[PDB]
Amino acid sequence: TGTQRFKEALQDPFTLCLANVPGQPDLRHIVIDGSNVAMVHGLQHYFSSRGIAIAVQYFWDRGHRDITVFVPQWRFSAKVRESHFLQKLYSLSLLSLTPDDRFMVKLAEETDGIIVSNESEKWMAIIRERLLPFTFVGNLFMVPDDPLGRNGPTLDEFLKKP
């Protein structure tokens, strides 16, 4: 029992260890909705920064080196669980503080651009075009193997620039 007690599924250990090796060259820039990811991991209740760290480790492990986690500036003050993961991401040039959806669309426009996330439809629509949904189990980050359905591409080719 206890919704809070169980969220200490955080006792299952996770360390952000990004292997110091160069990445593959034609992969797409991974744009991460830091808030969405952190809330999904925190069961829409906690800002669970480990959610972001886990998601970065996933793409870092596939060889992606152009990764940007957007998180609001005030999420550095703010009910944030394990904020130490944000500090580490910031200092490794993987995290930019928004001063909000427009920044991800802007960024993914400028780069090859994949958005990792679950009026003014112009901005809302652009997100649909590049959306990569996800789920967590615990520290396990899972993304669909056909990001856009069976008609659309495979995961491997969805994350390639060509």
Residue numbers in the entry: 411 to 487, 490 to 511, 524 to 542, 551 to 594
Give the exact sentences the study uses for this entry.
Therefore, to understand the contribution of this N-terminal extension to protein folding, stability, and catalysis, we determined the ex-PIN crystal structure that includes the N-terminal extension sequence. The asymmetric unit comprised two copies of the ex-PIN that pack to bury a surface area of 446 Å2, although there is no indication of dimerization for the ex-PIN at up to 2 mg ml−1 concentration in solution as determined by SEC-MALLS. The ex-PIN N-terminal sequence forms an N-terminal arm (Nt-Arm) comprising a short helix, α1 and an extended strand that packs against the core PIN domain. Further secondary structures are arranged in two helical subdomain wings (α2–α5 and α6–α8), a central β-sheet (β1–β4), small orthogonal sheet (β5–β6), and a C-terminal short helix, α9. The copies structurally superpose well with a RMSD of 1.4 Å over 167 of 183 Cα positions but with two local conformational differences. The first in the large loop that intersperses β3 and α6 that is disordered in Monomer-A. The second in the (α6–α8) helical wing, where in Monomer-A α7 is disordered and α8 is rotated by 25° relative to its position in Monomer-B. The Nt-Arm contains 20 residues (K417–D436) that wrap around the core PIN domain. PISA analysis reveals an extensive interface that buries 890 Å2 of surface containing salt bridge, hydrogen bonds and hydrophobic interactions.
KHNYN is a ZAP-binding protein required for ZAP-restriction of CpG-rich viral genomes. It contains an extended diKH, PIN nuclease, and CUElike domain, each of which are required for ZAP restriction of viral replication. Unlike the weak activity recently reported for the PIN domain, we demonstrate that the KHNYN ex-PIN domain is a highly active Mn2+-dependent single-stranded RNA endonuclease that cleaves with a preference for ApC, ApA, and UpA dinucleotides.
